[PDB]
Design a protein around this ligand. Structure first.
Ligand SMILES: [Mg+2]
Length: 476
RNA sequence: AAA
């Protein structure tokens, strides 16, 4: 039996790719995968059903997982008659792992052995896995689905597949999309457009694919070629209909151009197809907020008459959708911050607070996103609740979690104004002392940082944070 | 899916 458990780990499939269930909302993934099967016909059905099966096992539904794996076998027979045996390895891997979890050891073995046989047949240098670009590609996609944390591992996976077939249409889409997301991940300030080239190439290799095209259009918006982008959008919309995975990215395009009504039209159309989508609900709320803001700016932050009436309607709508986004994807960090921010604007602080505090307890979202929550809660504390003590705290956490980001200077500027103010009132305010300590340390003003920590330590001598700072402050 |  220990021999079997050893062999399982050697297999190449979802069970050995470190896809941790904690890093996602299991229901959202299971749901959206289901929706991708119905409404994203470009993507591999065999891959989605292999992934679905694994997801279902993470939900503790091993019986349904097998059923999913059966669908895959049928798809293997259908789409991959030729190259049947080699397309079965991942499916067979999930089978062996799923049966092992159901304590059907004899059955689990039947699959590993079935996998072993195929490996020597096409003698790969490994006994229970065969390196393959299509599998590297499936790997890339599963990784992507498990969120921000996996993007680099995803990128590499596609890179491994493209190493073999640099001109494969499918492979290029995966890579291009991955680099496109990494353009929007862990930004330090300005926008990134490493993905522009790979998308160019992806599109050329996939002429009829409007899903890949929409990313090129958005990436062209990002780099101030809005004209070229919008023409790409118009071409797509006249070329496809009611494909939620395409309409929603066109909606985004229009939204940023401030064409909110046209964005709302496209979203709504995507919605009647896929009404539970957290993507769509977020984008909707964003449009209502923006429209709401446009009015406030046009009335110097104090609308009267039908304006105030409209603004309150927009707020309520934006709340409805942010909440929907949040309820559908418990891992959707910006669903929480936008919801709470809108509750704040609405003056329902109790609701703002409850949403923020849930967002502050998400352990497994990325540091970049943790960082944004600390930032927004900090502002809520400062401007709505007027608690400078609490805001200073959260600006510090934001920087501690991620110190180089487009928020860096908003955070250090805020910490400096607040700490100075509070120190003009009480020169012995410790939190404010360690605050300027931390910031000056961050800015490289090593001496001023030391002075601030020394004043802090004089007040709170055996503080292990201030002792640590002064030390590491002496170590350059 | 925010900036
Ligand atoms: Mg999603």
């Amino acid at each position: 039996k220990d021999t079997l458990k050893a062999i399982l780990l050697e297999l190449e499939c979802h069970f050995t790719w470190n896809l941790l269930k904690e890093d996602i909302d299991l229901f959202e993934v299971e749901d959206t995968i289901g929706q991708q099967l119905e409404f994203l016909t470009t993507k591999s059905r065999l891959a989605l059903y292999n992934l679905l099966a694994y997801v279902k096992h993470l939900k503790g539904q091993n019986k349904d997982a097998l059923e999913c794996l059966e669908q895959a076998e049928e798809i293997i027979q259908q789409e991959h008659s030729d190259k049947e045996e080699v397309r079965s390895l991942v499916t067979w891997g999930n089978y062996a792992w799923v049966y092992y979890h159901m304590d059907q050891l004899e059955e689990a073995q039947k699959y590993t052995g079935k996998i072993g046989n195929v490996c020597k047949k096409l003698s790969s240098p490994s006994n229970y896995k065969l390196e393959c670009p299509e599998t590297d590609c499936e790997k890339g996609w599963a990784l992507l689905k498990f969120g921000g944390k996996y993007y680099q591992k995803a990128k590499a996976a596609f890179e491994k597949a493209l190493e073999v077939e640099p001109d494969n249409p499918e492979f290029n889409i995966g890579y291009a999309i991955t680099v496109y997301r990494l353009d929007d991940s862990d930004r330090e300030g300005s926008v990134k457009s490493f993905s522009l080239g790979p998308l160019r190439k992806a599109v050329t290799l996939n002429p009829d694919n409007s899903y890949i095209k929409v990313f090129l259009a958005l990436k062209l918006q990002d780099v101030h070629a809005e004209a070229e982008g919008e023409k790409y959008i118009e071409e797509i919309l006249d070329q496809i209909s009611s494909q939620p995975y395409v309409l929603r990215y066109a909606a985004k395009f229009y939204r940023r151009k401030n064409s909110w009504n046209k964005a709302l039209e496209l979203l709504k159309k995507a919605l009647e197809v896929t009404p539970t989508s957290s993507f769509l609900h977020h984008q909707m709320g964003l449009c209502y907020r923006a429209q709401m803001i446009q009015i406030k700016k046009a009335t110097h932050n104090r609308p009267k008459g039908k304006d105030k009436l409209k603004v309150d309607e927009l707020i309520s709508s934006a709340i409805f959708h942010f909440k929907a986004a949040m309820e559908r994807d418990s891992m959707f960090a910006f669903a929480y911050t936008d919801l709470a921010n809108m509750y704040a604007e609405g003056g329902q602080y109790s609701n703002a607070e409850d949403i923020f505090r849930k967002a502050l307890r998400l352990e497994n979202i990325t540091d970049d996103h943790k960082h944004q929550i600390h930032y927004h809660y900090g502002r809520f504390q400062e401007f709505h609740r007027k608690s400078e003590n609490t805001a200073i705290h959260h600006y510090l956490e934001a920087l501690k979690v991620k110190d180089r980001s487009p928020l860096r200077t908003k955070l250090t500027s805020a910490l400096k104004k607040l700490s100075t103010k509070r120190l003009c009132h009480n020169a012995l305010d410790v939190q404010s002392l360690s605050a300027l300590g931390f910031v000056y340390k961050l800015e490289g003003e090593k001496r001023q940082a030391a002075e601030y920590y020394e004043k802090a330590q004089k007040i709170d001598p055996e503080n292990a944070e201030f002792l640590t700072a002064l030390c590491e402050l002496r170590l350059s």
